[PDB]
Amino acid sequence: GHRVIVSDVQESFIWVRYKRNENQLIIFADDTYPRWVTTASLLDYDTVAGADKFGNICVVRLPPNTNDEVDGLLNGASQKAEVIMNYHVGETVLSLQKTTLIPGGSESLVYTTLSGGIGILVPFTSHEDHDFFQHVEMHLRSEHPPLCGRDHLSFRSYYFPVKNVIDGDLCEQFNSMEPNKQKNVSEELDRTPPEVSKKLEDIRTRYAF
Amino acid sequence: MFLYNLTLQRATGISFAIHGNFSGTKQQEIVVSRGKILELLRPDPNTGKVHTLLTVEVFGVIRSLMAFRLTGGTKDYIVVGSDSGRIVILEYQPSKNMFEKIHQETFGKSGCRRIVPGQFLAVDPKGRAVMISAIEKQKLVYILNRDAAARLTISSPLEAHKANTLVYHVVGVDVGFENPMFACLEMDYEEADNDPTGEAAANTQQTLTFYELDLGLNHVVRKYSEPLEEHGNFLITVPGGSDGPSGVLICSENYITYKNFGDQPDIRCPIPRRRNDLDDPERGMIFVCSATHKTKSMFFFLAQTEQGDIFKITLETDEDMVTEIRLKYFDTVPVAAAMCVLKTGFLFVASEFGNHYLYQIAHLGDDDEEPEFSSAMPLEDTFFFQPRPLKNLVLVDELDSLSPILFCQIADLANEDTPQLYVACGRGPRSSLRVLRHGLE
Amino acid sequence: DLIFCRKQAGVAIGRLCEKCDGKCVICDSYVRPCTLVRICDECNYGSYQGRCVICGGPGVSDAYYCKECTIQEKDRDGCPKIVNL
Amino acid sequence: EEQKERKIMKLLLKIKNGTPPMRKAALRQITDKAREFGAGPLFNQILPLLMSPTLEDQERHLLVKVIDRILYKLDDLVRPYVHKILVVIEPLLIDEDYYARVEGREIISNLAKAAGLATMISTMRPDIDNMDEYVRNTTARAFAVVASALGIPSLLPFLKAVCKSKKSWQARHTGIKIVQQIAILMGCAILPHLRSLVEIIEHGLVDEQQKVRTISALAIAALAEAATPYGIESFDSVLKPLWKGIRQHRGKGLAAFLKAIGYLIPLMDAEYANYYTREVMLILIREFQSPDEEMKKIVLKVVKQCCGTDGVEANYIKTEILPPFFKHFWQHRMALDRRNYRQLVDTTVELANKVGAAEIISRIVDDLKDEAEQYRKMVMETIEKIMGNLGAADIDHKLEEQLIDGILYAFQEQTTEDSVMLNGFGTVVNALGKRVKPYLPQICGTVLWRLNNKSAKVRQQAADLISRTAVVMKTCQEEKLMGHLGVVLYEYLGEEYPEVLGSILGALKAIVNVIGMHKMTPPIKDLLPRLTPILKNRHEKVQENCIDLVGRIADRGAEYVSAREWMRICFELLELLKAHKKAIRRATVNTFGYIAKAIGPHDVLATLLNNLKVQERQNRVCTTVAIAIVAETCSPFTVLPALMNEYRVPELNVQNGVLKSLSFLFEYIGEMGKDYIYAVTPLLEDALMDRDLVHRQTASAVVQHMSLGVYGFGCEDSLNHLLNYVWPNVFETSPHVIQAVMGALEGLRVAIGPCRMLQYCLQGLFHPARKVRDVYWKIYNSIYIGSQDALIAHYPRIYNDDKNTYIRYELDYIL
Amino acid sequence: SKYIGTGHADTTKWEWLVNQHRDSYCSYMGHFDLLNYFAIAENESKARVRFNLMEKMLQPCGPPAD
Amino acid sequence: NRFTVAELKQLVARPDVVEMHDVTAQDPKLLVHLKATRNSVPVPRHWCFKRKYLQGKRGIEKPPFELPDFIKRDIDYQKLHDAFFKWQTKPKLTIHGDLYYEGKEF
RNA sequence: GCCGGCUAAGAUCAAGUGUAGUAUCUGUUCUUAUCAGUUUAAUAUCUGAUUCCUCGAGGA
Ligand SMILES: CC[C@H](O)[C@@H](C)[C@H]1O[C@@H]1C[C@@](C)(O)/C=C/C=C(\C)[C@H]1OC(=O)C[C@H](O)CC[C@@](C)(O)[C@@H](OC(=O)N2CCN(C3CCCCCC3)CC2)/C=C/[C@@H]1C
Numbered sequence A: 001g002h003r004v005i006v007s008d009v010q011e012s013f014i015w016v017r018y019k020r021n022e023n024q025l026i027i028f029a030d031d032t033y034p035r036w037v038t039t040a041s042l043l044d045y046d047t048v049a050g051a052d053k054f055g056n057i058c059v060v061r062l063p064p065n066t067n068d069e070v071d072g073l074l075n076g077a078s079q080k081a082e083v084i085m086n087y088h089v090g091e092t093v094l095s096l097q098k099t100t101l102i103p104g105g106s107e108s109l110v111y112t113t114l115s116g117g118i119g120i121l122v123p124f125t126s127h128e129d130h131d132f133f134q135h136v137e138m139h140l141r142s143e144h145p146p147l148c149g150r151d152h153l154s155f156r157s158y159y160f161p162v163k164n165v166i167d168g169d170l171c172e173q174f175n176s177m178e179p180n181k182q183k184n185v186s187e188e189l190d191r192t193p194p195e196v197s198k199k200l201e202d203i204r205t206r207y208a209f
Numbered sequence B: 001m002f003l004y005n006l007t008l009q010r011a012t013g014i015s016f017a018i019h020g021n022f023s024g025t026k027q028q029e030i031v032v033s034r035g036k037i038l039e040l041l042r043p044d045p046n047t048g049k050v051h052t053l054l055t056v057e058v059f060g061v062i063r064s065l066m067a068f069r070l071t072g073g074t075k076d077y078i079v080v081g082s083d084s085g086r087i088v089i090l091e092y093q094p095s096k097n098m099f100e101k102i103h104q105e106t107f108g109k110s111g112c113r114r115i116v117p118g119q120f121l122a123v124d125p126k127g128r129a130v131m132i133s134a135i136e137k138q139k140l141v142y143i144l145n146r147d148a149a150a151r152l153t154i155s156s157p158l159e160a161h162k163a164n165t166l167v168y169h170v171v172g173v174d175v176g177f178e179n180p181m182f183a184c185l186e187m188d189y190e191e192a193d194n195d196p197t198g199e200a201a202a203n204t205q206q207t208l209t210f211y212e213l214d215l216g217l218n219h220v221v222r223k224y225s226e227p228l229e230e231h232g233n234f235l236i237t238v239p240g241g242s243d244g245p246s247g248v249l250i251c252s253e254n255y256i257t258y259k260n261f262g263d264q265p266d267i268r269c270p271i272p273r274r275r276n277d278l279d280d281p282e283r284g285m286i287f288v289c290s291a292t293h294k295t296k297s298m299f300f301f302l303a304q305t306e307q308g309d310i311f312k313i314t315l316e317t318d319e320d321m322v323t324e325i326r327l328k329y330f331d332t333v334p335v336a337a338a339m340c341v342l343k344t345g346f347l348f349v350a351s352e353f354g355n356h357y358l359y360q361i362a363h364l365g366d367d368d369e370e371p372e373f374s375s376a377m378p379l380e381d382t383f384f385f386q387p388r389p390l391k392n393l394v395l396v397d398e399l400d401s402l403s404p405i406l407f408c409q410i411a412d413l414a415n416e417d418t419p420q421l422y423v424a425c426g427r428g429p430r431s432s433l434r435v436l437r438h439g440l441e
Numbered sequence C: 001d002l003i004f005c006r007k008q009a010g011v012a013i014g015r016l017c018e019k020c021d022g023k024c025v026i027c028d029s030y031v032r033p034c035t036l037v038r039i040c041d042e043c044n045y046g047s048y049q050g051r052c053v054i055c056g057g058p059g060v061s062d063a064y065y066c067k068e069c070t071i072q073e074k075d076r077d078g079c080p081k082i083v084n085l
Numbered sequence D: 001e002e003q004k005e006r007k008i009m010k011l012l013l014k015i016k017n018g019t020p021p022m023r024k025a026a027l028r029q030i031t032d033k034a035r036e037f038g039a040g041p042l043f044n045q046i047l048p049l050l051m052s053p054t055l056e057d058q059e060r061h062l063l064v065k066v067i068d069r070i071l072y073k074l075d076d077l078v079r080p081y082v083h084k085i086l087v088v089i090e091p092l093l094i095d096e097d098y099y100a101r102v103e104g105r106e107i108i109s110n111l112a113k114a115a116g117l118a119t120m121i122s123t124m125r126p127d128i129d130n131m132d133e134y135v136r137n138t139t140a141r142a143f144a145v146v147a148s149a150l151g152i153p154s155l156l157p158f159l160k161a162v163c164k165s166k167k168s169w170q171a172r173h174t175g176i177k178i179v180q181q182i183a184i185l186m187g188c189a190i191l192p193h194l195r196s197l198v199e200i201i202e203h204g205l206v207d208e209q210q211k212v213r214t215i216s217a218l219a220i221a222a223l224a225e226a227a228t229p230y231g232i233e234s235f236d237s238v239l240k241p242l243w244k245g246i247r248q249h250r251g252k253g254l255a256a257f258l259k260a261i262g263y264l265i266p267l268m269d270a271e272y273a274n275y276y277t278r279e280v281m282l283i284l285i286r287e288f289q290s291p292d293e294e295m296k297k298i299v300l301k302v303v304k305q306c307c308g309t310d311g312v313e314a315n316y317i318k319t320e321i322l323p324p325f326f327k328h329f330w331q332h333r334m335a336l337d338r339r340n341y342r343q344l345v346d347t348t349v350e351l352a353n354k355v356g357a358a359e360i361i362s363r364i365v366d367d368l369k370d371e372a373e374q375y376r377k378m379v380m381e382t383i384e385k386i387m388g389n390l391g392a393a394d395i396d397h398k399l400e401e402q403l404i405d406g407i408l409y410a411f412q413e414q415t416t417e418d419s420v421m422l423n424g425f426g427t428v429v430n431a432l433g434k435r436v437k438p439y440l441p442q443i444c445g446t447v448l449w450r451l452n453n454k455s456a457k458v459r460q461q462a463a464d465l466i467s468r469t470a471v472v473m474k475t476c477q478e479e480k481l482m483g484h485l486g487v488v489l490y491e492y493l494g495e496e497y498p499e500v501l502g503s504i505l506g507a508l509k510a511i512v513n514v515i516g517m518h519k520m521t522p523p524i525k526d527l528l529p530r531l532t533p534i535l536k537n538r539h540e541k542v543q544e545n546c547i548d549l550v551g552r553i554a555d556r557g558a559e560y561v562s563a564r565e566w567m568r569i570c571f572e573l574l575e576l577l578k579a580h581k582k583a584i585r586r587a588t589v590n591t592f593g594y595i596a597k598a599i600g601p602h603d604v605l606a607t608l609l610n611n612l613k614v615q616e617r618q619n620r621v622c623t624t625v626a627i628a629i630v631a632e633t634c635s636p637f638t639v640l641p642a643l644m645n646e647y648r649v650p651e652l653n654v655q656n657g658v659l660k661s662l663s664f665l666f667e668y669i670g671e672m673g674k675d676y677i678y679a680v681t682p683l684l685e686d687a688l689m690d691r692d693l694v695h696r697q698t699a700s701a702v703v704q705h706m707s708l709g710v711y712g713f714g715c716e717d718s719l720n721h722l723l724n725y726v727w728p729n730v731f732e733t734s735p736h737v738i739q740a741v742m743g744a745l746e747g748l749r750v751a752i753g754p755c756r757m758l759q760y761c762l763q764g765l766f767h768p769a770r771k772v773r774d775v776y777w778k779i780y781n782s783i784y785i786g787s788q789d790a791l792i793a794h795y796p797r798i799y800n801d802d803k804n805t806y807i808r809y810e811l812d813y814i815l
Numbered sequence E: 001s002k003y004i005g006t007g008h009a010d011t012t013k014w015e016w017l018v019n020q021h022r023d024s025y026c027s028y029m030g031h032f033d034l035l036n037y038f039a040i041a042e043n044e045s046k047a048r049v050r051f052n053l054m055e056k057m058l059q060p061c062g063p064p065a066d
Numbered sequence F: 001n002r003f004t005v006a007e008l009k010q011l012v013a014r015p016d017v018v019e020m021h022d023v024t025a026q027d028p029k030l031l032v033h034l035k036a037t038r039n040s041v042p043v044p045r046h047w048c049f050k051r052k053y054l055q056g057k058r059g060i061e062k063p064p065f066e067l068p069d070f071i072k073r074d075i076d077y078q079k080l081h082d083a084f085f086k087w088q089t090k091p092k093l094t095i096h097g098d099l100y101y102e103g104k105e106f
Numbered sequence G: 001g002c003c004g005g006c007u008a009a010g011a012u013c014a015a016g017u018g019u020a021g022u023a024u025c026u027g028u029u030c031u032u033a034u035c036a037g038u039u040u041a042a043u044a045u046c047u048g049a050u051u052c053c054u055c056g057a058g059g060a
């Protein structure tokens, strides 16, 4: 309602305010990274989700200090925005949209890819779920490595290091391991394989199908 | 803020496709590559349906995919070159329904790099050597062997580096259990970086280079190198040994050339054009993919142009020498990234964008009235043909593919309660607007 | 004259002696060995078949890169055998 | 001038006793020089030096490489000398040194490639018909090498001609030997030419000469061994003659034919494999009674090969093969025969692997009680191999009783301490498991009698047995005379022999590790003060076992000894982190972790800081390692405040120790450090603003380890903040400081990303001063070699000038 | 120095820019979805875009100075 | 055959980034253009100094180390652990381009 | 450091001591000057040329 978000072909995001009574468009914030933006989506009054030509998704948020009423420090704008999320998808995203997919479910961020893929990014609501899924990802990175010789953490850090994303496509490969390795993985999380499978299915059915 | 990523619908675009006996039985399967997904398909010879058997996320970028088989074996392997600095060899396990990694060999740093190999992958037709190559100076060769338990052994790599060199394509050459050979389309740019006039940039030719691996002496040597008439795209292995001559087909702009080392002259055939074409007259014509079909009696090729026209290429031969190249118009299908000709008479078409197709090859041989072009025919001026609807092929199956998705909106535009996905996808005259709903039909 | 070989590494496994057993060949760390060391064919031949990659004594166990060197992809250079001229 | 070229080609001494750079320089120059020097002088001088009686291995390797390179260039000028070279290097192919053989084969291969096939054949043909058997072997091996170099079809006509020679049987013999050597040398690469070779050599099996038949059978066996598991259609014209011959021949030729049969059987189907086995089996059963021992070895090999196929089933084997096998081969005469002893053991194990363990095990277990101990050790070896490969499932009450009684009687009737009876006892008890309840009293009595006395070489073997069997000893719910054994092992703690003390400590540890500290007889407050003086022993096994025992005690029985003694023990263990051996260090780390977890971090940390303040270098480094261990076992939350309080001391050499400890702490804890980066940031700021060089070097090391420790965990804010303080040190001339700065920069390249590093390098890449340009291009090359691909998305836009186009237009496309 | 694409205190603008153009073209050839983007943008087959990039590999940024 | 400061200031889009030595570079136009990129912190400013990066003035004599507030408020159980992780605050941090130099502490 | 300066702001050339390494100390001198070349981001450095006053002496 109040602000304007601009996407540059090579710079990431510019924040502008329209002065209704002065008839002025003033730049009051920008970013510190070059991004080849393909699409953008507003998440709330301060946060923007962006996509890239090189296959990355990022979330950028204004610091709470941010002053809207303006009338460079890096040859740019005086105030900067912080990057709170970085993820390499592996395919070029051209659509981002916040929506609820199932009746009586929760809101997720649905993205779309140039290869015909569809995916979601969903938020965690508690620290326990986040910690459990983080440990699952850690243990599956070592005992179930990618098939063609790639490092999983290095692949999701292709252009920028990963920040605050858990790869649920690596995590659901637990259901396709052999029972011996499923037991070796599950007994480190202090759990049985059926409980891990149920916990994996719960977060998926909470948001998507 | 902490996020969890989930995939709802995997990618359906195909980059590479190979076929072979990957389960060890007599039926044939296809292995297709998505960007980061590997997938095994099996078309049913009774109904013509294509079923997906296995699909695995590899968490990388697949750049080259080959199949090979050792002498005396009944099972095909899979060689993958990716954006890692490793070459991998895989084996399908039908009883476990998974891909088992056989070998891993590390040779360089990760990423899609200029001089680290992984873009080009060639294999010896008898299965005793494999070559991995970058776009620049570095090339590596691995020798493949077998122990007494019939397991695959890999050797240490042999280097074939050559500075200031660009590679367009590499293929293995079919010799008769002689020393393995590899052919490369190469270009040297050293002279072009030293001439400020800009005349060394022009007047620079592609070469066709042959690399011979001497298994007795264990080294790779440059044997032959010849400059070409114009710049060509990919190469085609001609079946040799006791069934066919042993050379290469060079696909180029407006031409296709046969070449072999020795006393064999060069044979050129111009690519026919459509009669009363409506396209800009300044544009040339290239081939975009090819498919070989070898039979115990004869062989032929299937090449497709940018307009989507498949021609059937045969080779008129002598005891050892080739005398003519003959081209004949076969059919028109969408532009494909890969084509696989299957025994039991099926053609699989994986398009660059949109749905993929499986065709039944209905008419074997060629009993027809349409003209057959040749390299022996004199022309001052080019050949012309008339495109027509399908005559040699019948459509049996169609696999849906959302690639490329260009715009999406999630909304309840009908008066259900669940929202639908409205997807503007496709390119050219094959674009469409698709409505997606969660459920079964 | 402490220089690495830096030749194309083959299928031969690097070896460490009783004095260097826990060491990393590149950074000399002792924490978290992660990746098995490979050496070229001229470093693994004849009398050179089993030898410490750091010093050159009789090998007793496998040489490893540390997790820190593996993260930075320092295991992707050539043969890490210390050679003196 | 002639010696002109000689004096200048002393290049080979330039290489032989020379430096590696001039080695390769003279190599290249002599390669360029070879064609003009001429093969005459070059070989006239090199072949003597290669014939030198005391040349080295790698000198020989370099000489062979020189030969290879000077042979590649001069190709068709080597012909008039080929013969000569061969007489020098036709030996080295039957040499007992493997690498000598490899070098000779490489030399002959490069010689055959340099010359032609006709030349090699013309020089090698006169020695085909020689009478000296020493020449006909090197000739065949050299012909095999030439076939491997120039290809098999290039030699196929000469072969087809030479083994049809009606002139003499020596030529035919040598041709068939050439085929055999080709098979032996090339292996599974002969498969496309298998039928050609077989039809070339097949007519020799029916020759009038007996030496030709034998060599033909040996060549068939070699081809079949090279072909496995492929190729049976190519062996079809040999099945009739081979079996008719094994039916009619007798002796050496019979042995050759039987070897051929045995190598051919595993290639067939069930029908043919089953049908052919019956025939060769009646013949082999007849041949069981042979006095010759070579014949026995061949018969054993053929039995093992045929009994391992699918066409032969266990019924026919137990009905026809087992009675004569066990009646003729199992006598102590086989035991003193060292040649076929291992063959008999392997054949019997592989028989049991198909027919079933029970029958074999019975038939030989009745023989465990015997007057000869050689026959006892043989049976024990076979039994424990079968037990380890299959187990004791179908072993029943009678067989279990017999096994136990036999192994017990064999244990006591032992002259010299051997590993055979030890391993047999161990694996038998371990395979029986919870089934041996009363033989547990029996075995305990036996080991008590063996451990009581007799020279401590029986006592250390008894201690090894206890150490390897205590698990099944206690898991059968028995603990009392377990304590009776532990009491005696305790009394056997003062021993002059360290080897026996190691086994005693191992047995004691295996006991206390498997029985609970609960309800167990020998008190810990008695064992541990008796145990602490042994930690200063200098034997490796004693040290390792003592440290492991103290670690187990501290892990489970920590509440039985005062904390002061634990403090003394840990302060003594501090010195063992310098051990030259890896197992000592591993056990010391484990035990220190246990003691720290037991007595608490506070007091040990205070003592470790005091010790870090006052000692020499190595002890301070070990103290740093100990602080890192304490902080990892007890969360670094308990160590960091006390360590940061020590940086507050206004005195150098104390702050530097704190910085070294923080460096190693972060390097050691890795991923656990993500919760502690905010706490150490102001201290690193202070240390990076300091004038002292060691301060900044160590702070850079800390930054590097912290960066590589947290990666993918979202700690980029503090790392960018710290980079703002690390970067001004790039203009430092001191080598150690700049080395640490480069390490920290390459760690931040991973943790923070290459985009930030390129942003820091851009303005200096083209500075007017050459110093700035040198430094910045070094940093940029380090950033470029790692992650060259990511930089594609980060490069800044550069505008076109009048002459050149610099905009990348494809990235400006907008779909 | 042995790695192609590295620089030094005497590197010029032209060498830097042709190095980044050349590895940009190689990165386009490698990544499957960037080539898709370009082939949709300029309405060409992917084989044609690949061949055009390979042809541009030879002399990007024009011929050198003086 | 080299620019002057005022002459090069007339050619560039951003003249306030031009400095004394910038006219003495091998390619001043690229140097000034990279000095104007919308990022890319500048050089540490003491390359031309002659005092080895440590100023011997400004009275650096001061308190050794002031621990954070969370430092002050067995030795402490899991309850004081709870205290140390409830009291833990984020310290003052400088953003991407704020390089340190000898003077900027007072 | 003290209230612009009091020559502790730099370079250099010989010798001593000593370390695995960094180093530490003494004599010094410091062009007080100009031009040309080398060179340095610029200095620097190096390479060459260049009647008088006072009370037998000194300075320029
Ligand atoms: C500045 C430090 C010094 O350089 C010091 C390490 C060393 O230079 C001295 C010389 C000398 C001989 O006195 C000591 C050398 C080395 C040691 C004491 C190391 O221990 C050994 O050699 C034994 C062996 O190599 C393995 C020891 C081990 C497993 O504890 C090793 O550390 C590890 O592998 N860790 C520590 C980290 N830890 C965590 C736990 C979670 C998952 C695994 C990784 C992270 C896993 C186990 C290092 C220990 C000593 C420093």
Ligand SMILES: [Zn+2]
Residues within 6 Å of the ligand: C024, C025, C026, C027, C028, C029, C065, C066, C067, C068, C069
């Ligand atoms: Zn390392």
Ligand SMILES: [Zn+2]
Residues within 6 Å of the ligand: C016, C017, C018, C019, C020, C052, C053, C054, C055, C056, C057
């Ligand atoms: Zn060593």
Ligand SMILES: [Zn+2]
Residues within 6 Å of the ligand: C005, C006, C007, C039, C040, C041, C042, C043, C079, C080, C081
């Ligand atoms: Zn090496």
